[PDB]
Amino acid sequence: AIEVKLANMEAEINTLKSKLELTNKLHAFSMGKKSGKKFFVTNHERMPFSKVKALCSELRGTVAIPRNAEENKAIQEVAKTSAFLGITDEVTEGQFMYVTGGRLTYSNWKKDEPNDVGSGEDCVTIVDNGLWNDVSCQASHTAVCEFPA
Amino acid sequence: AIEVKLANMEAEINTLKSKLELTNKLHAFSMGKKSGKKFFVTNHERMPFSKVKALCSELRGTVAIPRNAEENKAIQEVAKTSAFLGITDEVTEGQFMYVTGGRLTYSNWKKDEPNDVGSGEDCVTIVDNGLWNDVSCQASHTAVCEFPA
Amino acid sequence: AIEVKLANMEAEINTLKSKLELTNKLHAFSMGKKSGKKFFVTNHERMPFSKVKALCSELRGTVAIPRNAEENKAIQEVAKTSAFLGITDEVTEGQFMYVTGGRLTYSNWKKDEPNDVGSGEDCVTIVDNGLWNDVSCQASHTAVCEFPA
Ligand SMILES: OC[C@H]1O[C@H](O[C@@H]2[C@H](O)[C@@H](O)O[C@H](CO)[C@H]2O)[C@@H](O)[C@@H](O)[C@@H]1O
Ligand SMILES: OC[C@H]1O[C@H](O[C@@H]2[C@H](O)[C@@H](O)O[C@H](CO)[C@H]2O)[C@@H](O)[C@@H](O)[C@@H]1O
Ligand SMILES: OC[C@H]1O[C@H](O[C@@H]2[C@H](O)[C@@H](O)O[C@H](CO)[C@H]2O)[C@@H](O)[C@@H](O)[C@@H]1O
Ligand SMILES: [Ca+2]
Ligand SMILES: [Ca+2]
Ligand SMILES: [Ca+2]
Ligand SMILES: [Ca+2]
Ligand SMILES: [Ca+2]
Ligand SMILES: [Ca+2]
Ligand SMILES: [Ca+2]
Ligand SMILES: [Ca+2]
Ligand SMILES: [Ca+2]
Ligand SMILES: [Cl-]
Ligand SMILES: [Cl-]
Ligand SMILES: [Cl-]
């Protein structure tokens, strides 16, 4: 009977795993995830870049990254205020790279930016109208995470 | 060892079932579900009717169907823009049925609607008024899913 | 082999426990939970105090309790209307206590409140502007639950 109980339990587990996946899909849906698109979410908390990266990492997501105008607008409507994007030029000044790998393709810089102000600005925030401004990674901005499509 | 381990994993499984049930109750509450009332949810995406049904079906819900004046208003409250209802006359033109089966009971059609205008209209949408209008199941309108009371 | 399958089941269970914890963390985050702080949620339903206690209790939370001005404003923003707080003087008239134990410290009473009006008022509501007013526990106000930091 032991092997039977085990098989029945593996069946329960398979069912439970599917149920949890459904819970995740309904949650993503209720928070705006569009079909076939990445899911963007925020708690409206402002913190230094390293903390945003750590936070999204803990949720198994990454710092929000706009790969085109549509995604940029999506992030813009989720944030409501200045928010960090998963982009920095920490390696080579002026060479923005995604924190998940690869050179920046789509960009939406504000007039006169990036300007690597004062002691330097190697992080990026999306601001008003959805435009971009480089800022200090130590500055506190809104944490917005993204999850895969 | 073996039998005690198996017995404990059965209890772990049941504990996980209880927690997931609790998680689902909390999510429904946060989504606005009122006690002993069905609730509606949307990701604010606009799409063809066939996609709305498939999407809600996957989430184990159905395309929102107002059974009375109250519910019809709750959906309107959630949608905010034209949204598909789980009603169509695809089977027999003129005869609208619920996607869940059965013939129409309560309704709230707009004046001189449904009319099956143009090349035809077999789906139904709730407008920024609560009134209903048949439209092309191919047109794109907001997806609003409904879940059991 | 039996022992192999059992060890796999343990791994599956531990994986499921991890994923559910992540689902809970992401949901809290999506609900505005700030790092190291408790969060608040409401379904916007109005009901007597005993019903709110039972509802929050079931979700493994408690009726919202503002411990300082920051928390008070967060609860105010979530409520958007009059809502019960986890504070009452049901046990000893005039001495407000937290439903979870302990005498009231931080408070935000409107002028001339609390006043135990009429036959008496032993519960507390936060109002539109964030100030507090004692009311009848039998009155119906918005249900707002709080969850631990
Ligand atoms: O050093 C931060 C930032 O300062 C300046 O931009 C300002 C900020 O974006 C924020 O305060 O909003 C202001 C009004 O829109 C804006 O001037 C610039 O020097 C910018 O380059 C710099 O990163
Ligand atoms: O074919 C769609 C629909 O078109 C006409 O109604 C219009 C639509 O409901 C929508 O575009 O909003 C318009 C006003 O805001 C409205 O006139 C009608 O021909 C209707 O019968 C038809 O279903
Ligand atoms: O705002 C004061 C008081 O208002 C409500 O009670 C009412 C007042 O005592 C007064 O208007 O008389 C009414 C009965 O005639 C009574 O309901 C309550 O909200 C109370 O809690 C509050 O202190
Ligand atoms: Ca630099
Ligand atoms: Ca720089
Ligand atoms: Ca700058
Ligand atoms: Ca037809
Ligand atoms: Ca038709
Ligand atoms: Ca029509
Ligand atoms: Ca009393
Ligand atoms: Ca009293
Ligand atoms: Ca009072
Ligand atoms: Cl920097
Ligand atoms: Cl059609
Ligand atoms: Cl009372």
PDB file of N, CA, C and O in Angstrom, chain C residues 83-149:
ATOM      1  N   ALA C  83     -13.447  53.818   8.173  1.00  0.00           N
ATOM      2  CA  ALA C  83     -13.101  52.411   8.357  1.00  0.00           C
ATOM      3  C   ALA C  83     -12.798  52.069   9.805  1.00  0.00           C
ATOM      4  O   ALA C  83     -12.232  52.879  10.520  1.00  0.00           O
ATOM      5  N   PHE C  84     -13.173  50.867  10.242  1.00  0.00           N
ATOM      6  CA  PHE C  84     -12.878  50.455  11.620  1.00  0.00           C
ATOM      7  C   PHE C  84     -11.379  50.258  11.861  1.00  0.00           C
ATOM      8  O   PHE C  84     -10.644  49.862  10.958  1.00  0.00           O
ATOM      9  N   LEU C  85     -10.943  50.508  13.099  1.00  0.00           N
ATOM     10  CA  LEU C  85      -9.555  50.314  13.503  1.00  0.00           C
ATOM     11  C   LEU C  85      -9.569  49.227  14.580  1.00  0.00           C
ATOM     12  O   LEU C  85     -10.590  49.009  15.230  1.00  0.00           O
ATOM     13  N   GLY C  86      -8.442  48.555  14.776  1.00  0.00           N
ATOM     14  CA  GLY C  86      -8.372  47.504  15.781  1.00  0.00           C
ATOM     15  C   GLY C  86      -8.178  48.074  17.173  1.00  0.00           C
ATOM     16  O   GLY C  86      -7.262  47.672  17.894  1.00  0.00           O
ATOM     17  N   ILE C  87      -9.050  49.013  17.545  1.00  0.00           N
ATOM     18  CA  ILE C  87      -8.983  49.694  18.849  1.00  0.00           C
ATOM     19  C   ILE C  87     -10.410  49.794  19.407  1.00  0.00           C
ATOM     20  O   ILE C  87     -11.313  50.210  18.683  1.00  0.00           O
ATOM     21  N   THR C  88     -10.625  49.398  20.665  1.00  0.00           N
ATOM     22  CA  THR C  88     -11.962  49.489  21.280  1.00  0.00           C
ATOM     23  C   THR C  88     -11.846  49.714  22.788  1.00  0.00           C
ATOM     24  O   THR C  88     -10.780  49.503  23.371  1.00  0.00           O
ATOM     25  N   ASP C  89     -12.937  50.146  23.420  1.00  0.00           N
ATOM     26  CA  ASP C  89     -12.933  50.294  24.876  1.00  0.00           C
ATOM     27  C   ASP C  89     -14.097  49.439  25.385  1.00  0.00           C
ATOM     28  O   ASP C  89     -14.779  49.794  26.349  1.00  0.00           O
ATOM     29  N   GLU C  90     -14.294  48.296  24.718  1.00  0.00           N
ATOM     30  CA  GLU C  90     -15.368  47.338  25.052  1.00  0.00           C
ATOM     31  C   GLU C  90     -15.151  46.671  26.405  1.00  0.00           C
ATOM     32  O   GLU C  90     -16.113  46.354  27.112  1.00  0.00           O
ATOM     33  N   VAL C  91     -13.882  46.433  26.742  1.00  0.00           N
ATOM     34  CA  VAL C  91     -13.540  45.755  27.984  1.00  0.00           C
ATOM     35  C   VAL C  91     -13.725  46.625  29.224  1.00  0.00           C
ATOM     36  O   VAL C  91     -14.245  46.158  30.241  1.00  0.00           O
ATOM     37  N   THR C  92     -13.309  47.883  29.138  1.00  0.00           N
ATOM     38  CA  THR C  92     -13.473  48.820  30.239  1.00  0.00           C
ATOM     39  C   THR C  92     -13.751  50.197  29.650  1.00  0.00           C
ATOM     40  O   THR C  92     -12.862  50.833  29.064  1.00  0.00           O
ATOM     41  N   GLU C  93     -14.985  50.658  29.814  1.00  0.00           N
ATOM     42  CA  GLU C  93     -15.402  51.943  29.256  1.00  0.00           C
ATOM     43  C   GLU C  93     -14.384  53.043  29.493  1.00  0.00           C
ATOM     44  O   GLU C  93     -13.872  53.191  30.601  1.00  0.00           O
ATOM     45  N   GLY C  94     -14.084  53.804  28.442  1.00  0.00           N
ATOM     46  CA  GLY C  94     -13.129  54.899  28.554  1.00  0.00           C
ATOM     47  C   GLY C  94     -11.659  54.574  28.324  1.00  0.00           C
ATOM     48  O   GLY C  94     -10.871  55.470  28.019  1.00  0.00           O
ATOM     49  N   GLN C  95     -11.283  53.308  28.487  1.00  0.00           N
ATOM     50  CA  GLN C  95      -9.895  52.882  28.303  1.00  0.00           C
ATOM     51  C   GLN C  95      -9.750  52.119  26.998  1.00  0.00           C
ATOM     52  O   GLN C  95     -10.063  50.935  26.930  1.00  0.00           O
ATOM     53  N   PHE C  96      -9.288  52.791  25.957  1.00  0.00           N
ATOM     54  CA  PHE C  96      -9.135  52.098  24.689  1.00  0.00           C
ATOM     55  C   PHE C  96      -7.925  51.166  24.703  1.00  0.00           C
ATOM     56  O   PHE C  96      -6.891  51.470  25.298  1.00  0.00           O
ATOM     57  N   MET C  97      -8.092  50.005  24.078  1.00  0.00           N
ATOM     58  CA  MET C  97      -7.053  48.975  24.012  1.00  0.00           C
ATOM     59  C   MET C  97      -6.961  48.471  22.581  1.00  0.00           C
ATOM     60  O   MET C  97      -7.929  48.544  21.836  1.00  0.00           O
ATOM     61  N   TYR C  98      -5.801  47.950  22.205  1.00  0.00           N
ATOM     62  CA  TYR C  98      -5.644  47.373  20.878  1.00  0.00           C
ATOM     63  C   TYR C  98      -6.337  46.006  20.946  1.00  0.00           C
ATOM     64  O   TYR C  98      -6.323  45.361  22.001  1.00  0.00           O
ATOM     65  N   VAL C  99      -6.961  45.569  19.850  1.00  0.00           N
ATOM     66  CA  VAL C  99      -7.645  44.267  19.851  1.00  0.00           C
ATOM     67  C   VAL C  99      -6.653  43.139  20.124  1.00  0.00           C
ATOM     68  O   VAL C  99      -7.027  42.074  20.609  1.00  0.00           O
ATOM     69  N   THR C 100      -5.383  43.385  19.814  1.00  0.00           N
ATOM     70  CA  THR C 100      -4.326  42.403  20.033  1.00  0.00           C
ATOM     71  C   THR C 100      -3.646  42.545  21.393  1.00  0.00           C
ATOM     72  O   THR C 100      -2.673  41.836  21.690  1.00  0.00           O
ATOM     73  N   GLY C 101      -4.151  43.462  22.213  1.00  0.00           N
ATOM     74  CA  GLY C 101      -3.592  43.654  23.540  1.00  0.00           C
ATOM     75  C   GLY C 101      -2.835  44.951  23.759  1.00  0.00           C
ATOM     76  O   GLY C 101      -2.175  45.464  22.858  1.00  0.00           O
ATOM     77  N   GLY C 102      -2.945  45.493  24.966  1.00  0.00           N
ATOM     78  CA  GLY C 102      -2.238  46.718  25.290  1.00  0.00           C
ATOM     79  C   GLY C 102      -3.061  47.978  25.182  1.00  0.00           C
ATOM     80  O   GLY C 102      -3.946  48.095  24.324  1.00  0.00           O
ATOM     81  N   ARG C 103      -2.744  48.930  26.055  1.00  0.00           N
ATOM     82  CA  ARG C 103      -3.435  50.212  26.104  1.00  0.00           C
ATOM     83  C   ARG C 103      -3.047  51.102  24.939  1.00  0.00           C
ATOM     84  O   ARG C 103      -1.909  51.087  24.492  1.00  0.00           O
ATOM     85  N   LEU C 104      -4.014  51.870  24.452  1.00  0.00           N
ATOM     86  CA  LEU C 104      -3.780  52.786  23.346  1.00  0.00           C
ATOM     87  C   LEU C 104      -2.727  53.824  23.724  1.00  0.00           C
ATOM     88  O   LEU C 104      -2.773  54.401  24.821  1.00  0.00           O
ATOM     89  N   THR C 105      -1.770  54.041  22.827  1.00  0.00           N
ATOM     90  CA  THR C 105      -0.747  55.063  23.036  1.00  0.00           C
ATOM     91  C   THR C 105      -0.980  56.119  21.965  1.00  0.00           C
ATOM     92  O   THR C 105      -1.773  57.042  22.167  1.00  0.00           O
ATOM     93  N   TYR C 106      -0.305  55.996  20.824  1.00  0.00           N
ATOM     94  CA  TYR C 106      -0.514  56.952  19.746  1.00  0.00           C
ATOM     95  C   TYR C 106      -1.999  57.032  19.409  1.00  0.00           C
ATOM     96  O   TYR C 106      -2.676  56.012  19.370  1.00  0.00           O
ATOM     97  N   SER C 107      -2.514  58.240  19.188  1.00  0.00           N
ATOM     98  CA  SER C 107      -3.920  58.413  18.848  1.00  0.00           C
ATOM     99  C   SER C 107      -4.091  59.627  17.929  1.00  0.00           C
ATOM    100  O   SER C 107      -3.187  60.457  17.818  1.00  0.00           O
ATOM    101  N   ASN C 108      -5.239  59.733  17.268  1.00  0.00           N
ATOM    102  CA  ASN C 108      -5.461  60.856  16.354  1.00  0.00           C
ATOM    103  C   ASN C 108      -6.926  61.307  16.345  1.00  0.00           C
ATOM    104  O   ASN C 108      -7.526  61.569  15.292  1.00  0.00           O
ATOM    105  N   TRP C 109      -7.487  61.414  17.545  1.00  0.00           N
ATOM    106  CA  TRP C 109      -8.881  61.805  17.743  1.00  0.00           C
ATOM    107  C   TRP C 109      -9.287  63.159  17.178  1.00  0.00           C
ATOM    108  O   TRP C 109      -8.525  64.131  17.251  1.00  0.00           O
ATOM    109  N   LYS C 110     -10.495  63.223  16.628  1.00  0.00           N
ATOM    110  CA  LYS C 110     -11.015  64.501  16.152  1.00  0.00           C
ATOM    111  C   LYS C 110     -11.260  65.271  17.451  1.00  0.00           C
ATOM    112  O   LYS C 110     -11.309  64.674  18.530  1.00  0.00           O
ATOM    113  N   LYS C 111     -11.403  66.585  17.359  1.00  0.00           N
ATOM    114  CA  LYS C 111     -11.689  67.390  18.546  1.00  0.00           C
ATOM    115  C   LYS C 111     -13.010  66.891  19.157  1.00  0.00           C
ATOM    116  O   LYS C 111     -13.939  66.533  18.435  1.00  0.00           O
ATOM    117  N   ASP C 112     -13.061  66.854  20.484  1.00  0.00           N
ATOM    118  CA  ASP C 112     -14.225  66.413  21.250  1.00  0.00           C
ATOM    119  C   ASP C 112     -14.581  64.931  21.096  1.00  0.00           C
ATOM    120  O   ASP C 112     -15.725  64.528  21.334  1.00  0.00           O
ATOM    121  N   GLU C 113     -13.593  64.129  20.700  1.00  0.00           N
ATOM    122  CA  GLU C 113     -13.760  62.680  20.566  1.00  0.00           C
ATOM    123  C   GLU C 113     -12.610  62.073  21.365  1.00  0.00           C
ATOM    124  O   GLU C 113     -11.548  62.692  21.499  1.00  0.00           O
ATOM    125  N   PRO C 114     -12.795  60.862  21.914  1.00  0.00           N
ATOM    126  CA  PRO C 114     -13.992  60.010  21.855  1.00  0.00           C
ATOM    127  C   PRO C 114     -15.081  60.587  22.781  1.00  0.00           C
ATOM    128  O   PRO C 114     -14.764  61.315  23.726  1.00  0.00           O
ATOM    129  N   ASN C 115     -16.349  60.280  22.516  1.00  0.00           N
ATOM    130  CA  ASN C 115     -17.416  60.816  23.356  1.00  0.00           C
ATOM    131  C   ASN C 115     -18.478  59.813  23.790  1.00  0.00           C
ATOM    132  O   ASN C 115     -19.433  60.182  24.458  1.00  0.00           O
ATOM    133  N   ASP C 116     -18.305  58.546  23.413  1.00  0.00           N
ATOM    134  CA  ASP C 116     -19.227  57.476  23.813  1.00  0.00           C
ATOM    135  C   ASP C 116     -20.675  57.926  23.658  1.00  0.00           C
ATOM    136  O   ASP C 116     -21.474  57.793  24.583  1.00  0.00           O
ATOM    137  N   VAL C 117     -21.000  58.459  22.486  1.00  0.00           N
ATOM    138  CA  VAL C 117     -22.327  58.977  22.200  1.00  0.00           C
ATOM    139  C   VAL C 117     -23.520  58.027  22.392  1.00  0.00           C
ATOM    140  O   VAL C 117     -23.416  56.812  22.175  1.00  0.00           O
ATOM    141  N   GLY C 118     -24.650  58.612  22.799  1.00  0.00           N
ATOM    142  CA  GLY C 118     -25.889  57.869  22.996  1.00  0.00           C
ATOM    143  C   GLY C 118     -25.812  56.725  23.986  1.00  0.00           C
ATOM    144  O   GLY C 118     -25.390  56.908  25.124  1.00  0.00           O
ATOM    145  N   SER C 119     -26.235  55.538  23.561  1.00  0.00           N
ATOM    146  CA  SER C 119     -26.179  54.369  24.435  1.00  0.00           C
ATOM    147  C   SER C 119     -24.734  53.897  24.578  1.00  0.00           C
ATOM    148  O   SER C 119     -24.433  52.993  25.369  1.00  0.00           O
ATOM    149  N   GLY C 120     -23.836  54.518  23.812  1.00  0.00           N
ATOM    150  CA  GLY C 120     -22.439  54.154  23.896  1.00  0.00           C
ATOM    151  C   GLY C 120     -21.750  53.892  22.561  1.00  0.00           C
ATOM    152  O   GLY C 120     -22.385  53.523  21.567  1.00  0.00           O
ATOM    153  N   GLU C 121     -20.434  54.097  22.546  1.00  0.00           N
ATOM    154  CA  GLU C 121     -19.626  53.864  21.348  1.00  0.00           C
ATOM    155  C   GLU C 121     -18.315  53.277  21.841  1.00  0.00           C
ATOM    156  O   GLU C 121     -17.539  53.954  22.495  1.00  0.00           O
ATOM    157  N   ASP C 122     -18.077  52.008  21.532  1.00  0.00           N
ATOM    158  CA  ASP C 122     -16.868  51.348  21.994  1.00  0.00           C
ATOM    159  C   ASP C 122     -15.866  51.006  20.885  1.00  0.00           C
ATOM    160  O   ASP C 122     -14.782  50.524  21.173  1.00  0.00           O
ATOM    161  N   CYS C 123     -16.238  51.217  19.626  1.00  0.00           N
ATOM    162  CA  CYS C 123     -15.304  50.952  18.534  1.00  0.00           C
ATOM    163  C   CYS C 123     -14.763  52.262  17.971  1.00  0.00           C
ATOM    164  O   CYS C 123     -15.212  53.353  18.354  1.00  0.00           O
ATOM    165  N   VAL C 124     -13.802  52.166  17.058  1.00  0.00           N
ATOM    166  CA  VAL C 124     -13.179  53.369  16.507  1.00  0.00           C
ATOM    167  C   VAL C 124     -13.039  53.338  14.993  1.00  0.00           C
ATOM    168  O   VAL C 124     -12.672  52.313  14.418  1.00  0.00           O
ATOM    169  N   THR C 125     -13.350  54.457  14.349  1.00  0.00           N
ATOM    170  CA  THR C 125     -13.205  54.545  12.900  1.00  0.00           C
ATOM    171  C   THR C 125     -12.234  55.660  12.541  1.00  0.00           C
ATOM    172  O   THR C 125     -12.165  56.674  13.241  1.00  0.00           O
ATOM    173  N   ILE C 126     -11.460  55.463  11.476  1.00  0.00           N
ATOM    174  CA  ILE C 126     -10.610  56.536  10.994  1.00  0.00           C
ATOM    175  C   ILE C 126     -11.544  57.154   9.927  1.00  0.00           C
ATOM    176  O   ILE C 126     -12.215  56.424   9.186  1.00  0.00           O
ATOM    177  N   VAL C 127     -11.639  58.478   9.867  1.00  0.00           N
ATOM    178  CA  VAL C 127     -12.539  59.087   8.891  1.00  0.00           C
ATOM    179  C   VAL C 127     -11.847  59.596   7.632  1.00  0.00           C
ATOM    180  O   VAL C 127     -10.640  59.438   7.479  1.00  0.00           O
ATOM    181  N   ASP C 128     -12.627  60.188   6.728  1.00  0.00           N
ATOM    182  CA  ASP C 128     -12.115  60.717   5.465  1.00  0.00           C
ATOM    183  C   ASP C 128     -10.791  61.477   5.552  1.00  0.00           C
ATOM    184  O   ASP C 128      -9.896  61.239   4.739  1.00  0.00           O
ATOM    185  N   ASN C 129     -10.661  62.389   6.518  1.00  0.00           N
ATOM    186  CA  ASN C 129      -9.421  63.153   6.661  1.00  0.00           C
ATOM    187  C   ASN C 129      -8.371  62.519   7.587  1.00  0.00           C
ATOM    188  O   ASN C 129      -7.381  63.161   7.929  1.00  0.00           O
ATOM    189  N   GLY C 130      -8.587  61.283   8.020  1.00  0.00           N
ATOM    190  CA  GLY C 130      -7.586  60.638   8.855  1.00  0.00           C
ATOM    191  C   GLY C 130      -7.749  60.733  10.358  1.00  0.00           C
ATOM    192  O   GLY C 130      -7.095  59.997  11.097  1.00  0.00           O
ATOM    193  N   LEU C 131      -8.598  61.641  10.821  1.00  0.00           N
ATOM    194  CA  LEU C 131      -8.840  61.783  12.253  1.00  0.00           C
ATOM    195  C   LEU C 131      -9.699  60.610  12.708  1.00  0.00           C
ATOM    196  O   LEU C 131     -10.260  59.895  11.875  1.00  0.00           O
ATOM    197  N   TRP C 132      -9.801  60.419  14.017  1.00  0.00           N
ATOM    198  CA  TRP C 132     -10.559  59.310  14.584  1.00  0.00           C
ATOM    199  C   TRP C 132     -11.836  59.730  15.310  1.00  0.00           C
ATOM    200  O   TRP C 132     -11.927  60.822  15.866  1.00  0.00           O
ATOM    201  N   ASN C 133     -12.798  58.816  15.335  1.00  0.00           N
ATOM    202  CA  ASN C 133     -14.069  59.022  16.021  1.00  0.00           C
ATOM    203  C   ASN C 133     -14.573  57.700  16.577  1.00  0.00           C
ATOM    204  O   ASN C 133     -14.568  56.704  15.857  1.00  0.00           O
ATOM    205  N   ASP C 134     -14.987  57.662  17.848  1.00  0.00           N
ATOM    206  CA  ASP C 134     -15.523  56.415  18.365  1.00  0.00           C
ATOM    207  C   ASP C 134     -16.958  56.274  17.856  1.00  0.00           C
ATOM    208  O   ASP C 134     -17.658  57.266  17.678  1.00  0.00           O
ATOM    209  N   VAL C 135     -17.361  55.034  17.566  1.00  0.00           N
ATOM    210  CA  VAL C 135     -18.706  54.733  17.062  1.00  0.00           C
ATOM    211  C   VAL C 135     -19.208  53.412  17.635  1.00  0.00           C
ATOM    212  O   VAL C 135     -18.505  52.725  18.380  1.00  0.00           O
ATOM    213  N   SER C 136     -20.443  53.068  17.287  1.00  0.00           N
ATOM    214  CA  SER C 136     -21.024  51.807  17.715  1.00  0.00           C
ATOM    215  C   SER C 136     -20.358  50.677  16.922  1.00  0.00           C
ATOM    216  O   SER C 136     -20.206  50.769  15.708  1.00  0.00           O
ATOM    217  N   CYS C 137     -19.972  49.617  17.618  1.00  0.00           N
ATOM    218  CA  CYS C 137     -19.351  48.465  16.990  1.00  0.00           C
ATOM    219  C   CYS C 137     -20.373  47.801  16.057  1.00  0.00           C
ATOM    220  O   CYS C 137     -20.008  47.053  15.152  1.00  0.00           O
ATOM    221  N   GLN C 138     -21.656  48.097  16.277  1.00  0.00           N
ATOM    222  CA  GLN C 138     -22.724  47.519  15.461  1.00  0.00           C
ATOM    223  C   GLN C 138     -22.905  48.265  14.142  1.00  0.00           C
ATOM    224  O   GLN C 138     -23.596  47.783  13.241  1.00  0.00           O
ATOM    225  N   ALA C 139     -22.310  49.451  14.040  1.00  0.00           N
ATOM    226  CA  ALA C 139     -22.392  50.234  12.814  1.00  0.00           C
ATOM    227  C   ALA C 139     -21.524  49.579  11.730  1.00  0.00           C
ATOM    228  O   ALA C 139     -20.580  48.844  12.031  1.00  0.00           O
ATOM    229  N   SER C 140     -21.859  49.841  10.471  1.00  0.00           N
ATOM    230  CA  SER C 140     -21.106  49.284   9.354  1.00  0.00           C
ATOM    231  C   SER C 140     -20.116  50.272   8.756  1.00  0.00           C
ATOM    232  O   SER C 140     -20.488  51.340   8.272  1.00  0.00           O
ATOM    233  N   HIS C 141     -18.841  49.911   8.808  1.00  0.00           N
ATOM    234  CA  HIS C 141     -17.796  50.753   8.242  1.00  0.00           C
ATOM    235  C   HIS C 141     -16.862  49.862   7.433  1.00  0.00           C
ATOM    236  O   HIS C 141     -16.930  48.634   7.524  1.00  0.00           O
ATOM    237  N   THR C 142     -15.990  50.480   6.649  1.00  0.00           N
ATOM    238  CA  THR C 142     -15.083  49.736   5.779  1.00  0.00           C
ATOM    239  C   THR C 142     -14.112  48.803   6.479  1.00  0.00           C
ATOM    240  O   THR C 142     -13.462  49.175   7.463  1.00  0.00           O
ATOM    241  N   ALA C 143     -14.014  47.587   5.943  1.00  0.00           N
ATOM    242  CA  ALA C 143     -13.127  46.568   6.478  1.00  0.00           C
ATOM    243  C   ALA C 143     -11.700  46.745   5.933  1.00  0.00           C
ATOM    244  O   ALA C 143     -11.467  46.678   4.724  1.00  0.00           O
ATOM    245  N   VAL C 144     -10.751  46.987   6.830  1.00  0.00           N
ATOM    246  CA  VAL C 144      -9.358  47.162   6.435  1.00  0.00           C
ATOM    247  C   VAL C 144      -8.531  46.286   7.368  1.00  0.00           C
ATOM    248  O   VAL C 144      -8.603  46.416   8.599  1.00  0.00           O
ATOM    249  N   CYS C 145      -7.769  45.369   6.773  1.00  0.00           N
ATOM    250  CA  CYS C 145      -6.931  44.453   7.529  1.00  0.00           C
ATOM    251  C   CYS C 145      -5.472  44.886   7.442  1.00  0.00           C
ATOM    252  O   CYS C 145      -5.065  45.512   6.465  1.00  0.00           O
ATOM    253  N   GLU C 146      -4.695  44.559   8.466  1.00  0.00           N
ATOM    254  CA  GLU C 146      -3.268  44.852   8.450  1.00  0.00           C
ATOM    255  C   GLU C 146      -2.530  43.516   8.569  1.00  0.00           C
ATOM    256  O   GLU C 146      -3.029  42.558   9.186  1.00  0.00           O
ATOM    257  N   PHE C 147      -1.353  43.458   7.951  1.00  0.00           N
ATOM    258  CA  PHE C 147      -0.505  42.277   7.970  1.00  0.00           C
ATOM    259  C   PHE C 147       0.880  42.737   8.452  1.00  0.00           C
ATOM    260  O   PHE C 147       1.307  43.847   8.151  1.00  0.00           O
ATOM    261  N   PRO C 148       1.593  41.884   9.210  1.00  0.00           N
ATOM    262  CA  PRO C 148       2.922  42.153   9.783  1.00  0.00           C
ATOM    263  C   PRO C 148       4.049  42.634   8.862  1.00  0.00           C
ATOM    264  O   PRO C 148       4.070  42.329   7.677  1.00  0.00           O
ATOM    265  N   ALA C 149       4.991  43.386   9.424  1.00  0.00           N
ATOM    266  CA  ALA C 149       6.124  43.880   8.639  1.00  0.00           C
ATOM    267  C   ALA C 149       7.043  42.726   8.227  1.00  0.00           C
ATOM    268  O   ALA C 149       6.932  41.627   8.804  1.00  0.00           O
TER     269      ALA C 149
END
